[PDB]
UniProtKB/Swiss-Prot annotation, chains B, C:
It catalyses: methane + a quinol + O2 = methanol + a quinone + H2O. Cu cation 1 binds at residues 1, 107. It is found in: Membrane. The lineage of its organism: Bacteria, Pseudomonadati, Pseudomonadota, Gammaproteobacteria, Methylococcales. This is Particulate methane monooxygenase alpha subunit. One of its GO terms (molecular function) is monooxygenase activity. It holds the Pfam family Monooxygenase_B. Its EC number is 1.14.18.3. Its cofactor is Cu(2+). Keywords: Copper, Membrane, Metal-binding, Monooxygenase, NAD, Oxidoreductase, Signal, Transmembrane, Transmembrane helix. Binds 3 copper ions per subunit. Two of these (copper ion 1 and 3) form a binuclear cluster.
Length: 238, 382, 382
């Protein structure tokens, strides 16, 4: 009844997973992860890559696949009682997104930042690259989409047309593929050194600012709460 | 670590490191290890690399597993960037204090301005002990002696916490009240402005005045303690003293130089011609940190990294003494797994198939002549 | 004026001016005053200053209180920019004609390309007379001799007035009528186009044709008188003849060099070592236009600016003759109010605490050796 600790899943699922990761690199950062031309890299680190990409395509196909088919067809008439329960679960999806972004855009990002300072890169595939770009980012993008779709398929208001701020919020993440990938790409001609002030990194900054579309998304979410028959009891009682 | 993946010809024709030496192979926390040697900036410096107008003498390690206590190019201490001059040879000396227990592959590298860390040979050095043992003491011109490991740590923390707390305090004050869906709607139908009132705007300026106040108080309080302070010292050191080398007595001419496709060896046809007056033999070809020796002629004692030293890697078609006045053409082959391991073989992907090295010649009584060669290096597949 | 506020180390390590001389201290309108001297571009030129690839030999005064009749670096007249070469020493000669009565502090300065006017010492020179006396005659390759003070003045004026008047004439023609609030409203409700008609659009093209006409008439009329004309001559002069200096016979080594915080003096510990063959003594340290002398050893006669000459500013711990072959370490102190007045003391705010000067040594029969020193200069507060 109402909004459960199905939420506690959402918070701990990343926390545990990513804390296992931080341990995992923590021990193989040094050991295998230093010299990429050693065969212990092609097993502890490269295989890790292929594993995750595959797992991501799959879970993405399953996760989006699931929700799009369990899209509520008879949305036209379902109670305000559930138009709340659902609105709340949607908010859990957003907490999961925001948490997922934290890890990607703050944690593993500025971590890679430190890593560059301490070893000259042997590949575009350092440990922290395997984790920052090809694990961390796909995850928060998948979470992103999930939420979007949940809202579109589960709640009226959001079922009517496309939310521009919500589209920007989930597509910005996805556009950071080359944006953050041009980091090392762009910086190679004029200056190969990974200077974060270089124009090559400006795409990451622009796509990072698309996270501010969360403000427009939350405004629309709270308007979906008010349309669903809420915000009138205690609001008027105030 | 980090060479290998970088362009093989960049590595051949950028900086040549030789007469490298390391005072110890195993060292206790807080102990010193001293790296010495020489480096030559190659006359045919690559276009893609800004000339070293502003270069920096760095150290190639996994972070501060050692701290650099001192560094010297020529006689001079080099904490800044420095202007090195193409063609010239210099002697450097890095002095490292050990800080983190472990096995470190320490390199000596150049921070070569516009594009490139120019990484020298790396040698494995082992630190034994506890990081908790490490001290980094420094005495100021101000009287006090401090430990750089922890100096000013608590201060940093305080001021960040304090300000952080105040940030929280501010959002905290507003968040005693409900935050979103009521305040949103109030703004909507009808006016807001019931949302904020007196008991609010007094606190607003409370904060505002309190903040400016604490900043200025704090600042001129920080000025009261610590009244003697300088700006960050910076700026490229010019006038680096280069090494005065005697004109070499041997001259060599590189006619064709080839490498086998899937291979581990580079052949070159040299005309060595011995001016000056003592029968000379060829003892080493140094190329990209990789050193190839004729052990019939020369033997490393400096403990040069084992993966880069090819003990009898270098074979000369005729390495008998070359008499003074005499001049001969000889076929030379530098061969060793290191050629594939450090990817000099990856020259086949480079846009400029030209190599560059140092040859070392030795006379009868064992004093040496260094000539430098460079030439196009051509693949052979069939 | 304008040094003093500029970075103390820039001023120390950029251009050294010495053997300065000024032919007169007081001068009548239309009279000449000639500045001579030498300057060395410091080998350790600062990074923040584009090398003098394109520099200009200027004069430091309040406008054309003098006009520069001639300027010479090496033998050559230098009206353009010129390429000076780091490390080299040159002799210059500026020749000034007086134009405005008064007291002028004239400096000799370098226009040093990418960031910086490099201002030399300034000397006070007095002009007596009337500006109405000044002439600046010049004879053309065209026959005529003109006065640059007023040449082409009336012409300039005419053409500006004429065109200006026509601009007025045009607004004038339209402003016989009412300008705003009726014309605005007419456009508004209903159409405009009653506002402009025939008697108007004839004048419009009257003006338009008249203008093109007068321009082209005027131009090929200006081409008829003045048929011989060149383009602005411009472009950096290369190949500046530097001065051929004999290798110095003394060599010095700067071990530590310090200055007191609130102070007026810089100490340095030099190892002077006298190669060449006559007992030598130290007579001057020149630093940033400021000249410090041991008057037991040397006396300025050139009338060097009084605020920059420290008559016995320089004291050597032992300034007895240094015998040939002998070599000694000595403590030297350059001391004078000028150190605080010209703000060399403002080195404490600079990001590069390194100084640079010229030392001048004199043998028994009074012929001199110039060595240049530079080194880090370190503060002491306690």
């Amino acid at each position: 009844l109402l909004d459960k600790k199905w939420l506690t899943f959402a918070l701990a699922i990343y926390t545990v997973f990513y804390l296992w990761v931080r341990w995992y690199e923590g021990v193989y950062g040094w050991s295998a992860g230093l010299d990429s031309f050693a065969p212990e890299f092609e097993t502890y680190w490269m295989n890790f890559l292929y594993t995750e990409i595959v797992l991501e395509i799959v879970t993405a196909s399953i996760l989006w696949g699931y929700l799009w088919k369990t899209r509520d067809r008879n949305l036209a008439a379902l109670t305000p009682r559930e138009e709340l329960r659902r609105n709340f679960t949607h908010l859990v999806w957003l907490v999961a997104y925001a948490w997922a972004i934290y890890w990607g855009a703050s944690y593993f990002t500025e971590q890679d930042g430190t890593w560059h300072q301490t070893i000259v890169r042997d590949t575009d595939f350092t440990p922290s690259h395997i984790i920052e770009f090809y694990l961390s980012y796909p995850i928060y993008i998948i979470t992103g989409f999930a939420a979007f779709i949940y809202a579109k398929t589960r709640l009226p208001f959001f079922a009517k047309g496309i939310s521009l701020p919500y589209l920007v919020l989930v597509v910005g993440p996805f556009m950071i593929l080359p944006n953050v990938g041009l980091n090392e790409w762009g910086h190679t001609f004029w200056f190969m050194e990974e200077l974060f002030v270089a124009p090559l990194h400006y795409g990451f900054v622009i796509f990072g600012w698309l996270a501010l579309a969360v403000m427009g998304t939350l405004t629309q979410t709270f308007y979906s709460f008010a349309q669903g028959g809420l915000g009138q009891s205690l609001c008027e009682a105030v | 670590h980090g060479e290998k993946s970088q362009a093989a010809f960049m590595r051949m024709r950028t900086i040549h490191w030789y007469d490298l030496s390391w005072s110890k192979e195993k060292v206790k926390i807080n102990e010193t290890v001293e790296i010495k040697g020489k480096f030559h900036v190659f006359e045919g410096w690559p276009e893609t690399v800004d000339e070293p107008d502003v270069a920096f003498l760095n150290v190639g390690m996994p972070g501060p597993v050692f701290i650099r206590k001192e560094s010297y190019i020529g006689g001079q201490l080099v904490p800044r960037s420095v202007r090195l001059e193409i063609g010239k040879t210099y002697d450097f000396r890095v002095v490292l204090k050990a800080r983190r227990p472990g096995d470190w592959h320490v390199h000596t590298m150049m921070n070569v301005q516009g594009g490139g860390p120019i990484i020298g040979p790396g040698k494995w050095i082992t630190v034994e002990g506890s990081m908790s043992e490490f001290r980094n003491p420094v005495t100021t011109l101000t009287g006090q002696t401090v430990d750089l490991e922890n100096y000013n740590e608590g201060n940093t923390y305080f001021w960040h916490a304090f300000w952080f707390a105040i940030g929280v305090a501010w959002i905290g004050y507003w968040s005693r009240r409900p935050i979103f869906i009521p305040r949103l709607l109030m703004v909507d139908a009808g006016r807001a402005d019931e949302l904020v009132s007196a008991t609010d705007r007094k606190v607003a300026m409370g904060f505002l005045a309190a903040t400016i106040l604490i900043v200025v108080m704090a600042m001129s309080s920080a000025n009261s303690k610590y009244p003697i302070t300088i700006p960050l010292q910076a700026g490229t050191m010019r006038g680096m003293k280069p090494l005065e080398l005697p004109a070499p007595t041997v001259s060599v001419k590189v006619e064709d130089a080839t490498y086998r496709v899937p291979g581990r060896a580079m052949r070159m046809k040299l005309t060595i011609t011995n001016h000056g007056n003592s029968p000379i033999r060829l003892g080493e070809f140094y190329t990209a940190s990789v050193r190839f020796l004729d052990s019939d002629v020369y033997k490393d004692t400096t403990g040069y990294p084992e993966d880069l030293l090819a003990e009898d890697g270098l074979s000369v078609s005729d390495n008998s003494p070359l008499a003074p006045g005499e001049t001969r053409t000889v076929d030379v082959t530098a061969s060793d797994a290191a050629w594939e391991v450090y990817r000099l073989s990856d020259i086949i992907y480079d846009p400029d198939s030209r190599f560059a090295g140092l040859l070392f010649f030795f006379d009868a009584t064992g004093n040496r002549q260094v000539v430098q060669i460079d030439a196009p290096l051509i693949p052979s597949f069939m």
